[PDB]
Design a protein around this ligand. Sequence first.
Ligand SMILES: O=C(Cc1cccc(Cl)c1)Nn1nnc2ccccc21
Ligand SMILES: [Cl-]
Lengths: 305, 292
Amino acid sequence: SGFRKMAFPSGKVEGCMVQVTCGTTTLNGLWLDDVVYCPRHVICTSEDMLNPNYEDLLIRKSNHNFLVQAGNVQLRVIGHSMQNCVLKLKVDTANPKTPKYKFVRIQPGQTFSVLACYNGSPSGVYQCAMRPNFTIKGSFLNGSCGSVGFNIDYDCVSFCYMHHMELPTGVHAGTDLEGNFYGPFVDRQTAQAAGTDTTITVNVLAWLYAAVINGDRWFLNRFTTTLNDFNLVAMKYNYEPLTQDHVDILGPLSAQTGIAVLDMCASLKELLQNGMNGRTILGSALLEDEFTPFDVVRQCSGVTF
Amino acid sequence: SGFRKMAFPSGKVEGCMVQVTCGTTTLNGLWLDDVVYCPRHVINYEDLLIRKSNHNFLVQAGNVQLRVIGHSMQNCVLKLKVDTANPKTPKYKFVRIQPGQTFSVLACYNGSPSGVYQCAMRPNFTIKGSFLNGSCGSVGFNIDYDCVSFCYMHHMELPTGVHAGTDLEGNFYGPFVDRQTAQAAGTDTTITVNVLAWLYAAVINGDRWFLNRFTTTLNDFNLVAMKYNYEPLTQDHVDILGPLSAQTGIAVLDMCASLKELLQNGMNGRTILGSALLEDEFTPFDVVRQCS
Ligand SMILES: O=C(Cc1cccc(Cl)c1)Nn1nnc2ccccc21
Ligand SMILES: [Cl-]
């Protein structure tokens, strides 16, 4: 019993964190096999950030300009290449702690663990979700660039995010491990703002199924809804549209608890209309949207209370 | 910017998790040097233990079987002497924590870590964790510098879904016993010094709608706080909040007057750090560490 925001054990990622220094800038890098991955803005000054020409800044650099530190050992850089907004530093030593891994690009609504680092040293781990506006509500300070997001389903680490910047609202933007940004963001200091954010509907529904699994049914009602009528109501509360794919994905939780997806949708419509009336759901007074249908199945029991 | 419930990196603890099997029971053990620590309920405990031999205990570290060469009991923890020292043993200490203190939990099943979360020792000595059958033996810890301080070992779940366990020396937190009997969590209270620390964190992150021009005495605040099932705030708590008070410019009793108004009037449709409830699972030190 219980339902916590749970992160994956970070050990497999801790053994990959390194410190990358270029001139006066110091940030984090991910050391996998003989390559160190880090944000390409490590080669920039604060002035350069307005309109940086990365190809022009990189051509002026040599291997020995990049200092890479793994614990108390200095790694030797033997090559460098750029792939989109990521810099790949070829090093002379393969990381003996390299876990089994894959680079995966995620979609909005997906969750992942973040290992926040400073100076190549891990300081904390937390769970978060890729928002519909492609930002993440993380907890990062100056020096955290290069920190990574990941999932560890089974024994394989799937790297899905690398931290690049903080937007003016305090939210964070970054790339996949191939250097492609999530969202319409660029690694440039220019007027950039996160689009209006929305609630991840399929995740709120999954969390309502988790509450039913843990023994709570106070929010259920005798009504059902059509998918279209649900979406017309949901869009008035800034909720993401619920698609047929989302309904299909909620199938297993619907079969486990005995509550059809559109009946759970009707309970959601009512909660949006009435609020909680002094009650909580899984210790929360707000509707939680940072647990996916897959997270609920992984964390909750297979036997409904 | 941002404020998340953050756990310590779990790697130093992952390298200590093992699977312990005795008969039909399978739970988790903590392998430090040549000793495996696990709940004694894996087996009148002296009478049950005397009937066991070393080979009855099966210990598995990854895909390798460890050889048990000795066994002893310390309070509600069983210590299994093994033939191999854990080469991954970190620098460590066994520490007993107080209610209100927070720690990270590495939840495990079959000696395999599955998740890490942050939680607090409630004033009623229970923890609001997330555990399933097979999680027994999972541990709670903090990291201070490069040293792991082990503070909790999971033993059981109470009928309300909350959890109970011991320190690493086998002494229970709370008036609980390790057996199937009628046990219940006492009435819980809110950790006041932690709510205040979380209000300072909100001010640091630019959330100031709850600030007011008022102050209060420590006694008047405590008369108010006890009415809402909040733990009493002591002069030690006020002293501990000193650095956050100097950083934000809001005196502790000034922040108490904000807390008094939040308890009597509610939040009025507003949130604080994305929460509609007053959060009490961040200590003053957690706030300073996450905001530095
Ligand atoms: O934002 C930057 C530098 C930067 C500026 C402009 C563009 C780019 Cl790609 C990078 N660093 N970061 N990242 N997270 C932070 C949290 C707080 C303070 C600074 C932080
Ligand atoms: Cl995805």
